[model samples]
Target chain A: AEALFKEIDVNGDGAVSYEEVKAFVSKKRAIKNEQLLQLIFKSIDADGNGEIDQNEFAKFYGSI
Target chain B: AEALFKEIDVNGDGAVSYEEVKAFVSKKRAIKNEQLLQLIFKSIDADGNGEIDQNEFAKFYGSI
Candidate 1:
């Protein structure tokens, strides 16, 4: 509904806050396998397509 | 640009191998900052736009 910065700004302030930071980190950490798999090329190539494009990459990363 | 199976199949075998797994994992590890910083939402938003992304998060972790 809003821009990334505004959206992430849970405190609903101009800048993101520490509580927002903690919550954001929590969400990100919940899916830490995200780290072990960011070969980016290998991870999102789940479709078995020989090549990866921007859309494929963005969607996968977007889902996260 | 044929199939992902072919690309990651470094041994040119039908399946991905231990060494391939090892190497992929190793490559992933070289960027283990990717591990501690799976907080993707925040990581890439590092324009000092007021939020700290985990790329900054990882960069900090890796630095330490």
Candidate 2:
């Protein structure tokens, strides 16, 4: 989980926002449009904070 | 998040174990090997209960 977090964290700031997730997933998968990505990101964000921490990211990893 | 969980919870038992995750990810991605998959599963299992419930699965969805 830690490894995966770092993989998505991109800037190494220890947190992942929608941009990071969108950028990473965009390259790796076929998700289209900011609207859909925002919905996905919102689900992962959990607390509605607009970013994903390690704990939040771990929950999301299950589906991926 | 609910949709993704349902996607991985192949049996629709509302819970996911290492087997389910392995099968789903294997089909969608390149993970192989029981040991590595187990490790990934362990990280997501969170409470160490041997299965991923909705709460646990949510944490993992952030990474994928």
Best by lDDT: 2
Task: Please give the C-alpha DockQ score of model 1.
Answer: 0.09
Q: Give the residue spans of candidate 1 off by over 4 A.
A: A32-64, B1-64
lDDT tens digits by residue: candidate 2, A1-64? 6788899899998789999998898866644544555576677667875544455656777556
| Clash number by candidate, in order | 6, 14
True contacts recovered per prediction: 0.15, 0.00
Give candidate 2 regions above 4 Å deviation. Answer: A1-32, B1-64
The estimated TM-scores of all candidates read 0.25, 0.25
| Interface Cα RMSD, each model | 6.5, 10.7
Winning candidate number (TM-score)? 2
Best by DockQ: 1
Report the C-alpha lDDT of model 1 over A9-52, residue by residue, as the tens digit.
Answer: 67665655556755766776766867665665677776766677
RMSD of 1: 17.1
* Candidate 2 local lDDT, B1-64, one digit each (tens): 4576677667776555445654665676554576689999999999998999999898788645
lDDT of 1 by residue, B1-31 (tens): 5776665678786888888877877776757
